[PDB]
Design a protein around this ligand. Structure first.
Ligand SMILES: [Mg+2]
Ligand SMILES: [Mg+2]
Ligand SMILES: [Mg+2]
Ligand SMILES: [Mg+2]
Ligand SMILES: [Mg+2]
Ligand SMILES: [Mg+2]
Ligand SMILES: [Mg+2]
Ligand SMILES: [Mg+2]
Ligand SMILES: [Mg+2]
Ligand SMILES: [Mg+2]
Ligand SMILES: [Mg+2]
Ligand SMILES: [Mg+2]
Lengths: 212, 212, 212, 212, 212, 212
């Protein structure tokens, strides 16, 4: 099973959203981290089970999240476009090294002991040190990476403390939940319930009779 | 303090979104409950504290959630536009009878004992019985109004079980949260923290130095 | 398996307790909702599993709770007997439409999506509108219906706020818990433990050696 | 403030309930613990705050719970009347040594460090050793004393595992709740709410307009 | 499977630590309860599953905790050595009557209904009465045994309030956890994970490649 | 207020424990990070409130935990001494950049937004890259730094999975708790209680009458 949109269009639209950025530090760091991690970002999945488990699923996750972030930021002008876009591209980038590969997905030792938050934080700091960038945008992106899961029980070391962090958390939940929730409702006749999914707090969903 | 958009434009946009509806039963029921509760919907606030405590705040809340629902539904074609729009309009309608008025906001006996969910379930069923509609559309709207707070600890009798119910939950969270978060960060200089807000799990927020 | 007391004696005792009522509005509304839902109240069970799963179990549940409520109201004169009796009779009425029937018990779409609480709030309000009764006893009975489970995690939208609501809670839990504990303790030799039942917080019970 | 019933009638009715017991070991042990702790049982309060804080309030607690246990035992014949009565009498006996006295009630070192449960388990075993009684009745009474608070978070070392233990817990909760709940409702006009009480999970209670 | 150290050397070391004590009351009580419960102390295990499930395992638990308590007492002079040693010896003594025996370990009715805390507190107070000791030493040891599990959810009636109670809690955690967690990593090759053990909050452990 | 031990003896004993290490990679990385952060490690405190809030408190915390880790490593030979010592030295090193200084302690933007865990993981990765060390001991130390608070609710991104991680967690608990719990008991007459300390789950502590 592959993504519905082919991979090089996803790469082109992500590069276009890089080109749309205005803050030079943000675009430089994000373009570097996408460019050096290009193949694994374009191939690897975004989890092991229950969401985005297909090949090039990370890329589809990223593109859908940027589209919905563009919608939210167009409706609410108070947000920063560039910081949000960099945070939404870079937040699940660390799973290029947490997971083993597109074939026979498995947690490696580094991702199982560390996690995709802390490995991406240190990768971001290393990129900032290499590109001779020592401004506050690095630390704010590092926070966006740090707290995109929202709460301590789900893996965040710290609660979100910036507007863009809460935006990132809500878009992540909505996108992942909608993808698994559309996958759950596919093989169900209208008027029938769905299978008991696990990552949706152990719930069963109803397809109404009027959805054709 | 009033809403930034004057009130009759909000009413015009809500009636426009009524006219955009395709399902006859949904459109008829939603138009009835909008028309009969018109003045209190256009005047009353949408809470007592920490969000939408100003006059005609319910109308701004509803219009903002319709706009963001339009964005999400345009990006995800799987959702039903009509059911989502009706669930957005009717979910905080009950606070026209839970709250006392735009002046000296206070919980009445009916709102404090019952709540804004169980009062609109009853109101929706009365509207369905009066307009001679006995379709599953009514029951799915009862679910949308029933579980829009998302979890039992926040006031939901049941967990959400339909797609538009979870979208209702997330849109309500995001709109209320970003309104209270923008109200918190208005009077804060860049590089300074904000006041410790209560509705956001007792947290503080940092305004970055590059936000002008 | 049937109830130990035959059904028309249960109906006669419930009608006698209706006749013992002194408040005209309470008596009229309660008699209407008993008379209109008579056959399903007299046939349907009171749950699906772990308690009152036999035919005419709802009637035995109601009669046993009325006996307990008569005892508690006799010892404590501060309670209102009329409101308590009505809240006892009406609180599990909703499972005439939540459940499918005495044979092959299953949750219907209305009961699974809404629940037995929110359907009886609506039914009670509709009965009040039909009998031209618009007094506060309807609202207090709606609270009794609303919060008879007591806590949010068990399905109550609001915590109890009136005395008879907490009495409804404690009589409900005591009656259901005693019946499931008696059913677990039937087939156990003294000096032996019971099966690990699920509805009692996953516990086991010891039958003492001197219980014959 | 004294109990509504004078003290010597209360001692007489407790001795009458001793006489009504049929099991010789239960009757002997319970009479021993009532006799040797007589004055402090008849004088001391049953808490420091929020319930039974008046002089001779422990006796009122015991008498009211005997009456409620008699009602529940008359309605449900499966329970053992004697062991339930002994558990009702002996469960809050330990506060004769947890509390300092009727005047200036305060926790002593033994009650604060150990608790009223573990001190009555010890007292019960010492009385059993002194009266040359080595039957399972003693151990079941020790379990009644051990788990009368129901859950670990409220002070019970173990969950209840006997029918009379759960009936002990529910009678204790209902009587303490009723006394604090009637004391909250004394000074409140009809149609007015009550003061925010602490031990009722931080709730406010409503007096309906028809209670005179 | 037996303990690595033979039993009579272990009894000799416990007797040596008894002789090391300076407080006469503590030393007398602790020697009395070691002497009278000697054979079952030297034979019985210290749990049913997941830790110290082998014969003479309770003795190994006690001896290792005395050694580690000696370490903590040597580094931290503010602790009382005698009180700590007595609390370490006597906190799992009660499982000589909770468990059935070294062969076919099973919970008896006394241990399952009551627990090893409440039976051991009673044993301590009975020995205090018999040895004609009425000092605060008995009450502080009663608290040490009462709250050695640390929290209410794990079985403690009261939270620890004395220094040696927290010390006993932490040494008990560290010793039991280290024995179960050394037993988990015995059969695991370097670079491989361990079996998902239940007593360690359902976690898995990694053996590093450089551990030979 | 200063630490009881003057500072250069603490530096000498930490350097001695560095010299006692046998693993070359561990020893090199740990000496590099101690030497580079030397002055702030020797001056800064280890928290803001409730523990180690005095000047040079980090050094005293580190020295006491090394002594206790030496005790545990001597008693339990299965542990790795070098990895444990490095994890004990480096776990609160990040507070040289989280905190402002020994005078007027306050959280900086980096420490408050990120935390001392994720800063120190990044510093470990940078030190490994600079010293040209790319072996798994870096990753195991990174996990030691990551999970030394033990649970998600206290700030750990991941649960501990290596033996030295659980040992580091327990020694951190014991040392911090003991210093705050000795500080609470200094000004209390024997036979009197202590003030309710916040960091110990709001408990009150008793000083026994026989402690002189
Ligand atoms: Mg993530
Ligand atoms: Mg994502
Ligand atoms: Mg709402
Ligand atoms: Mg809303
Ligand atoms: Mg119910
Ligand atoms: Mg019921
Ligand atoms: Mg009690
Ligand atoms: Mg009581
Ligand atoms: Mg234990
Ligand atoms: Mg132990
Ligand atoms: Mg730390
Ligand atoms: Mg530390």
């Amino acid at each position: 099973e592959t993504a519905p949109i082919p991979k090089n269009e996803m790469m082109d639209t992500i590069t276009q959203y890089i080109f749309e950025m205005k803050n030079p530090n943000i675009q430089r760091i994000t373009r570097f981290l996408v460019k050096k991690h290009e193949a694994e970002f374009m191939d690897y999945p975004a989890a092991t089970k229950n969401h985005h488990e297909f090949v090039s699923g990370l890329a589809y996750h990223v593109v859908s999240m940027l589209n919905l972030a563009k919608a939210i930021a167009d409706l609410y002008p108070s947000l920063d476009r560039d910081l949000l876009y960099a945070g939404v591209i870079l937040h699940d980038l660390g799973k290029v090294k947490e997971l083993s590969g597109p074939v026979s997905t498995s947690y490696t030792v580094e991702g199982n002991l560390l996690g995709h938050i802390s490995i991406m934080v240190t990768e971001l700091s290393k990129a900032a040190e290499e590109l001779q960038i020592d401004s506050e945008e690095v630390l704010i992106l590092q926070h966006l990476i740090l707290s995109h899961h929202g709460k301590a029980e789900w893996g965040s070391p710290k609660p979100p403390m910036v507007k863009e962090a809460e935006i990132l958390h809500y878009i992540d939940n909505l996108d992942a939940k909608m993808n698994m929730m559309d996958r759950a409702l596919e093989r169900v006749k209208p008027g029938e319930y769905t299978e008991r999914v696990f990552a949706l707090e152990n719930r069963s969903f109803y397809k109404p009779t009027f959805h054709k």
